[PDB]
Symmetry: none
């Protein structure tokens, strides 16, 4: 039952107090599902404009993108558990989760911009 | 003074509660300055590749199109910003919005560059 981003942010107002940790972990799994669908969408969009100067291949783009997103996911999850363990207020936790999603959106933007330029230049000459 | 992108992102993490309107307007003006420098950089780069049946695309046309696209996006984003202010959006939502507007401008700048790179390349034969 994957929550949409909209449903997650609405649910972030039903949390006026810090909920139990199981609840918090459930929310983080929905966060992961949202970011991972963003990655799937990025790779789908990049595959569309990849060709069939630099000599970057689809396999290279895919390795780079997957390494950046997988490393970001690990780093964010670690920051999440540290927030939990230090018993942070609910407002801080909510801002942290929304900021992690924003950070993934910026990474997906950075990757799209980077490869849009390379692929478009390869399609030339 | 004009904040760098990195300085603006730093401020975002220091808005933890909802700040006065003057502060948010000030942040928006720095956002505008960052996106306008991105537009200046785009036109500089495009000048490098500009020339020196259907009509030939010239520097004038390229410049008119780019400035219309970025100026209209500026207007539309500012109108969405004022909507959030007036509806008293919580700070996490405003922060996501401003971050997303900068991503949208980065994408537009890249889309424009790729568009003209292709057009100027094809004409050159
Ligand atoms: Hg460029």
């Amino acid at each position: 039952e994957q929550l949409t981003r909209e449903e997650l942010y609405e649910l972030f107002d039903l949390l006026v107090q810090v909920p139990p940790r199981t609840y918090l972990l459930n929310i983080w799994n929905h966060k992961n599902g949202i970011c991972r669908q963003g990655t799937k969408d990025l790779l789908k969009n990049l595959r569309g404009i990849a060709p069939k100067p630099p000599k970057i291949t689809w396999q290279g783009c895919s390795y780079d993108c997957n390494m950046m997103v997988s490393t970001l996911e690990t780093e964010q999850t670690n920051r999440f558990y540290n927030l939990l363990n230090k018993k942070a207020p609910i407002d801080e936790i909510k801002s942290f989760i929304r900021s992690c999603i924003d950070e993934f959106d910026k990474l997906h933007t950075d990757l799209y911009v980077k490869y849009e330029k390379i692929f478009s230049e390869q399609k030339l000459e």
